[PDB]
Design a protein around this ligand. Sequence first.
Ligand SMILES: [K+]
Ligand SMILES: [K+]
Ligand SMILES: [K+]
Ligand SMILES: [K+]
Ligand SMILES: [K+]
Ligand SMILES: [K+]
Ligand SMILES: [K+]
Ligand SMILES: [K+]
Ligand SMILES: [K+]
Ligand SMILES: [K+]
Ligand SMILES: [K+]
Ligand SMILES: [K+]
Ligand SMILES: [K+]
Ligand SMILES: [K+]
Ligand SMILES: [K+]
Ligand SMILES: [K+]
Ligand SMILES: [K+]
Ligand SMILES: [K+]
Ligand SMILES: [K+]
Ligand SMILES: [K+]
Ligand SMILES: [Mg+2]
Ligand SMILES: [Mg+2]
Ligand SMILES: [Mg+2]
Ligand SMILES: [Mg+2]
Ligand SMILES: [Mg+2]
Ligand SMILES: [Mg+2]
Ligand SMILES: [Mg+2]
Ligand SMILES: [Mg+2]
Ligand SMILES: [Mg+2]
Ligand SMILES: [Mg+2]
Ligand SMILES: [Mg+2]
Ligand SMILES: [Mg+2]
Ligand SMILES: [Mg+2]
Ligand SMILES: [Mg+2]
Ligand SMILES: [Mg+2]
Ligand SMILES: [Mg+2]
Ligand SMILES: [Mg+2]
Ligand SMILES: [Mg+2]
Ligand SMILES: [Mg+2]
Ligand SMILES: [Mg+2]
Ligand SMILES: [Mg+2]
Ligand SMILES: [Mg+2]
Ligand SMILES: [Mg+2]
Ligand SMILES: [Mg+2]
Ligand SMILES: [Mg+2]
Ligand SMILES: [Mg+2]
Ligand SMILES: [Mg+2]
Ligand SMILES: [Mg+2]
Ligand SMILES: [Mg+2]
Ligand SMILES: [Mg+2]
Ligand SMILES: [Mg+2]
Ligand SMILES: [Mg+2]
Ligand SMILES: [Mg+2]
Ligand SMILES: [Mg+2]
Lengths: 259, 186, 183
Amino acid sequence: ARGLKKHLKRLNAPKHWMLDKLGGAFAPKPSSGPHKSRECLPLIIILRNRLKYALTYREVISILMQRQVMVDSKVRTDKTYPAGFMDVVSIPKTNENFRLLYDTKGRFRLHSVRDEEAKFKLCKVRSVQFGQKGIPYLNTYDGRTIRYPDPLIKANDTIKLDLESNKIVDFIKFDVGNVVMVTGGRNRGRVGVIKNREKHKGSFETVHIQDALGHEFATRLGNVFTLGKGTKPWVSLPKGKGIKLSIIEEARKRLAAQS
Amino acid sequence: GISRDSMHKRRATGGKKKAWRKKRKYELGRQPANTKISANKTVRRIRVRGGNVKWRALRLDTGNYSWGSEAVTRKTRILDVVYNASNNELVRTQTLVKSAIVQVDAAPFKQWYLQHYGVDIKKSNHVLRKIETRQKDRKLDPHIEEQFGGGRLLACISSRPGQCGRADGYILEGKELEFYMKKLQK
Amino acid sequence: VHVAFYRNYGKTFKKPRRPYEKERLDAELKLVGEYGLRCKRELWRVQYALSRIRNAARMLLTLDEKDPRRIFEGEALLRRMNRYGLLDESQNKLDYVLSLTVENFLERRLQTLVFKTGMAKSIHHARVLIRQRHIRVGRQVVNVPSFMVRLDSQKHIDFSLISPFGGGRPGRVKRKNQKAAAK
RNA sequence: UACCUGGUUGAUCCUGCCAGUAGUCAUAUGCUUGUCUCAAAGAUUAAGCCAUGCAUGUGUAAGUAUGAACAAAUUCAGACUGUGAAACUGCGAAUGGCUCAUUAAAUCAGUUAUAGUUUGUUUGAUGGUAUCUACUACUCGGAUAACCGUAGUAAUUCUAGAGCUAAUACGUGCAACAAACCCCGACUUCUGGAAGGGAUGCAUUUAUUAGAUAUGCGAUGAUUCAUGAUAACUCGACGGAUCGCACGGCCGCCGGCGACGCAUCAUUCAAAUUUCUGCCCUAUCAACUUUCGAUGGUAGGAUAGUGGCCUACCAUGGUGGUGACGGGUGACGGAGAAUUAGGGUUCGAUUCCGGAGAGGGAGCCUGAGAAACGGCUACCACAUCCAAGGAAGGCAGCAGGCGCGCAAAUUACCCAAUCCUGACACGGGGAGGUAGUGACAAUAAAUAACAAUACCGGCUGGUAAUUGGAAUGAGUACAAUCUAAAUCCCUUAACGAGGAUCCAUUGGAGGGCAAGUCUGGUGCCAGCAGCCGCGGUAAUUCCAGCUCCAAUAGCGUAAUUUAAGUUGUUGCAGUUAAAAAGCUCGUAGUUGGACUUUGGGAUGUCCCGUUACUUUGAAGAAAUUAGAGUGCUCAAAGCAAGCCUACGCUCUGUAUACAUUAGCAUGGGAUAACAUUAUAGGAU
RNA sequence: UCCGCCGGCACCUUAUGAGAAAUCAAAGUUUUUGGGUUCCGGGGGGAGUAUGGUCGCAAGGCUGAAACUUAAAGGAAUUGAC
RNA sequence: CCCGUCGCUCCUACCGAUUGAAUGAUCCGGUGAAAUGUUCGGAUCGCGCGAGAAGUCCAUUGAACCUUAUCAUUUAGAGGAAGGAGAAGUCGUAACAAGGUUUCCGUAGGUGAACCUGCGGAAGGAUCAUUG
RNA sequence: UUUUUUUUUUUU
Ligand SMILES: [K+]
Ligand SMILES: [K+]
Ligand SMILES: [K+]
Ligand SMILES: [K+]
Ligand SMILES: [K+]
Ligand SMILES: [K+]
Ligand SMILES: [K+]
Ligand SMILES: [K+]
Ligand SMILES: [K+]
Ligand SMILES: [K+]
Ligand SMILES: [K+]
Ligand SMILES: [K+]
Ligand SMILES: [K+]
Ligand SMILES: [K+]
Ligand SMILES: [K+]
Ligand SMILES: [K+]
Ligand SMILES: [K+]
Ligand SMILES: [K+]
Ligand SMILES: [K+]
Ligand SMILES: [K+]
Ligand SMILES: [Mg+2]
Ligand SMILES: [Mg+2]
Ligand SMILES: [Mg+2]
Ligand SMILES: [Mg+2]
Ligand SMILES: [Mg+2]
Ligand SMILES: [Mg+2]
Ligand SMILES: [Mg+2]
Ligand SMILES: [Mg+2]
Ligand SMILES: [Mg+2]
Ligand SMILES: [Mg+2]
Ligand SMILES: [Mg+2]
Ligand SMILES: [Mg+2]
Ligand SMILES: [Mg+2]
Ligand SMILES: [Mg+2]
Ligand SMILES: [Mg+2]
Ligand SMILES: [Mg+2]
Ligand SMILES: [Mg+2]
Ligand SMILES: [Mg+2]
Ligand SMILES: [Mg+2]
Ligand SMILES: [Mg+2]
Ligand SMILES: [Mg+2]
Ligand SMILES: [Mg+2]
Ligand SMILES: [Mg+2]
Ligand SMILES: [Mg+2]
Ligand SMILES: [Mg+2]
Ligand SMILES: [Mg+2]
Ligand SMILES: [Mg+2]
Ligand SMILES: [Mg+2]
Ligand SMILES: [Mg+2]
Ligand SMILES: [Mg+2]
Ligand SMILES: [Mg+2]
Ligand SMILES: [Mg+2]
Ligand SMILES: [Mg+2]
Ligand SMILES: [Mg+2]
């Protein structure tokens, strides 16, 4: 190519969007934004495919251009706006507040939240460094930059951010014994407590996580998001509480429900 | 035009490479500046990748040169080019390139020395006291002192005139000054 | 790109390896005549389906008894066979899947069932009745003889409500004859 | 899903192939063709050449209206505040679509790196010194479009003068006001402090300096890294002379919600280069590269940046039977496709990913991004128009035409769906969809069912252009439905079957291989026959009639797989079937004897150098494959959907598995490989 | 002369072995397929021919195709005929 | 049963004068459009200054062409000479029996043709055998 | 150990 690609073929869309194979030749290409294209959920999918408020692309645009949808307390009129992990989606007209979280199967789920819970969100810190004039600052994995951060905060920690004031109200250090959710890989959407951390010089760090039922799994450091201090998450989890159920037990539950 | 690609080169084994694509604009090269010393200053503006700017110096007359030992930087005049390590011909043409050895006017540095140390190479009591205090640690390289007599100082160009449009540098000192003086005495 | 290109399709039968086996020909003709099939392709399609199911069961039986994949797929296959009436509750082991014959699948055809419950005087009569829209499984009219009837749907087979044999509005021949006799 | 059969002989057992049998999301052709649902389609030969039409434009309250444009108002005043064409300005056109020519460690796949760079835009943060003695900031200056009117030319979004008038166009310019830090410094109650002056935003360039950590000081595995401070430097496209809504509080000053725009960092969308391992045939290719870069070093230039990328000087290096170099490919690579005991064999132009190209080369402007071709410039080859003076070109985009061939469709409709793009909720989109042609390929499925009578065989079955009424879709058509509008499908008034003329075909009948020692003709002729063989006057084999057989809306005929243990690693052969060099030596290669910690007590636990290999984990696009669920009437499919009709619910579902080699991490230390051992220069 | 050991050229008998057999005590220990290693065949002809290379004074040696053609050619053994 | 020359028809390749021809890619040398950078130049335009066209100078990238040579893929050719196939051609009888001179391998020579002969070799011999 | 050449095509 001679420059940036503006189209996304439907087969090339991320699988967790769950787009029909014969729905069309194209999928909504995520716009530039706080979240990466492969790790986002465009507002068009949320409003049309998931919530079914809009029956078409045109209806999605019509709904959004009325300034009726807010992301992180800010009105967004971009259909392909990348809304990702921990983001808050609010529709004041319908009195609906949603938080984007990964289900046990690794797909974004619109988790309904209370009004109080909709006033804050969690962020993961990438690094802390000095800006111009020697002013310290940190940036999160959702594109945010915060100046004069708490000196105790460091990379890979989780900060509680108040959307109304855009200030850090609390933070969690990345350490063993903290409940976390996996945001990538085959174990995406699972929730557990860190057991130990393996660090290799000049290589990715491995994190070992134990599920509430005792199941053990490991993942990379960049795929681990801390949800609270100790074993109690700071936000409400979706249905299933990040517990991955084997296909056999899922089938047993389905058959039991059938009768 | 000028290309920086490796397609035209040979393989490390010595075999020939067959073309599989045309030249790309992102691997281009441009003509050298060949900056010279002339009273008619001429710096050209170049629009480069990303919309950024480069400055091509065709002729330069003055430069920003620093005295390392004294931590003093002054704008002086470049007199001539004496030594060039890459190519001897670049000295005959008075080409201004990085790391070239040039002679610069010593007048600004002489003035600073006179004003600071009160020495040539009315006044208030406080100024006299200040100069006397500075006089305790006044140590001058004899070679630099002999250079100051002729009004010219050997210097090395530390900037790239063809990229930034300035012939800045520093004054030679110590072992480097001795090395280049020995190389010039021939 | 043409989005239609992404739809996939597959074959449903294979031709015999040896075209002219006399014993195979005799057996196939016997089955076709007994079940009133239109050609050997239907029998070969049923054989293809049976072979696929038997191969799946045989593959599963090779795995360890405690293998989760074996457990899951064996339960799925046994449930599938039970839903369509191929296997009885007592036949609750994958081993009994290997003992399935083409006749078992043929006995589940809507044509065979329609003949058996007594709605047709013959298998061919059942075929013509089905293809003429006189038969419904539940509330849905079915005109495909190859329709495989599940155990639950077996007892709902009845005449179409819009057909002469299930409701009113006799056929065009009867109406024409009645009109002719009116004079 | 581990299979064979005919053919050498008078007969036999072999080797061995030929022939047959089955398959191809495999091309083509022949005959035939009623219905429903899917669906490939000028790749192969010519990346050959192209008439004509279309395929890229774009407007919000929010840059610029005096159309001599339309509309409503104003009786008197009014800069304009309703629509606004045209035009300037801005943005886009570097995406998409098409094709596979070139290209053999190259593209490319997996796996790395940028501490070696650029990145319009989106998202989050961040903007303090300009005039200093001119002195608009209650707001600077000069043009030009549209318009208008003098035109030239055969002629083109070919073109020259003349008269106006705008800006978020162009060029300037106060840039609301400070502190702190540093230098010089008169003057001075003088180890001091002091008026005054200089410097001081952000950015650039070069120097000095800090950036620790066996009473302050950030980050990495690792950086004189982030960042701070000083001296200066640059004739700096920076630091708002912009626009829409409203309409308010103090005593003219303050004041909200937005739009657009400039700069810095981070982020996102990406690129460029890059690490390791991996590619078909060929030795009738064994040496290749190094004047003129080949391998490396030093210093420079250029680049967005690393680098012989280029220059100067220096050294003689670099690859190679572990196959370099050279050649061929009817070679773009991959995801994948066909066939499936296992191992394997063959294919991969084509819808997803990556690369390349726009007739062949080369060069380049604009721009964040192009060495762009529905951009420009030149040459080469083709080629249209001309009033002969000139002027215009690029279908391997959608259609369509010529040519080529065995070989491939309409010069149609539409932005309704999917999505992209612009100033933009609105425009545009031959991307894409709809419909047309379409026996590439795939799915379902008609051409009859039932009684009476008569014949036959044991109440029970079979046959009958004999009789009898019933059923129905192919077709036809109101209507509705479908649809962007149509059409088709689905539904359905009135019609629509007896030789149910609403008439099934393609190949065969000696064997392989299912089916006639039937009848007529021909007479080694004509012909058949994949192979073996038929035909010479009594032809199951030719040409025909009858009958019969196989498949069936399909079947016949003309590269590739299986069968092939006839390429053999699993797994073949070499005495006589084809085959071991006349003999020995011998370097590469391959292979290589044995030996070093066992046992009990107990109870996973206690006692007495470098690799191969194996276990486990992470990560490893989708589509395709396997596979869970789900009555599109079934099915191929699809990703749907189910209860009940609640102004709803199931947080509805949209699982899971697989994945050579190579890389990353982990446990084991049997079997193996390389290295080492004693002139002690050894261990402590 | 007799009894033994090692090494060698062979011979006779035998099958529990192999083999299509003829035969083989190695042509055995092979569908119960694997000790190491070199060469080398892939139906019959065209053909050890053409072309290129290389060696040789020459004769020729070594390396070595294809187009095309064809259903057998061929091994062992049995009976007969001669 | 069988071998060869000779005789007829057809098919396939091979050699070959023509200092053969075409195309593609590299090699030696030469010319060299266009563009870019540089030097000079100054029609003309605004307030002694600033901007600046045509043209010109030397370099860089470099199409295109000409010369030399080498590879790769095709292709014409008077004529010459090989092989194969085709029911009933001519001359012999070389191979099969001890095939009537046992056969065959290498080498050399010679004859219409099969073939004959010399030297050494093999049994795939027509002898597994003379302690006679 | 004198001399002894030859037998059209297909089929039975
Ligand atoms: K296709
Ligand atoms: K425009
Ligand atoms: K643009
Ligand atoms: K790669
Ligand atoms: K530190
Ligand atoms: K490759
Ligand atoms: K570089
Ligand atoms: K170098
Ligand atoms: K390629
Ligand atoms: K741009
Ligand atoms: K076209
Ligand atoms: K549309
Ligand atoms: K037959
Ligand atoms: K006759
Ligand atoms: K006859
Ligand atoms: K026959
Ligand atoms: K003889
Ligand atoms: K003989
Ligand atoms: K003669
Ligand atoms: K004959
Ligand atoms: Mg593209
Ligand atoms: Mg097999
Ligand atoms: Mg015979
Ligand atoms: Mg090609
Ligand atoms: Mg590589
Ligand atoms: Mg950016
Ligand atoms: Mg630094
Ligand atoms: Mg360098
Ligand atoms: Mg491909
Ligand atoms: Mg091709
Ligand atoms: Mg195509
Ligand atoms: Mg592609
Ligand atoms: Mg291109
Ligand atoms: Mg063309
Ligand atoms: Mg061109
Ligand atoms: Mg181009
Ligand atoms: Mg075009
Ligand atoms: Mg284009
Ligand atoms: Mg076709
Ligand atoms: Mg078909
Ligand atoms: Mg019919
Ligand atoms: Mg038969
Ligand atoms: Mg006859
Ligand atoms: Mg006949
Ligand atoms: Mg063999
Ligand atoms: Mg022989
Ligand atoms: Mg032999
Ligand atoms: Mg031999
Ligand atoms: Mg040898
Ligand atoms: Mg052979
Ligand atoms: Mg004879
Ligand atoms: Mg004789
Ligand atoms: Mg003889
Ligand atoms: Mg004779």
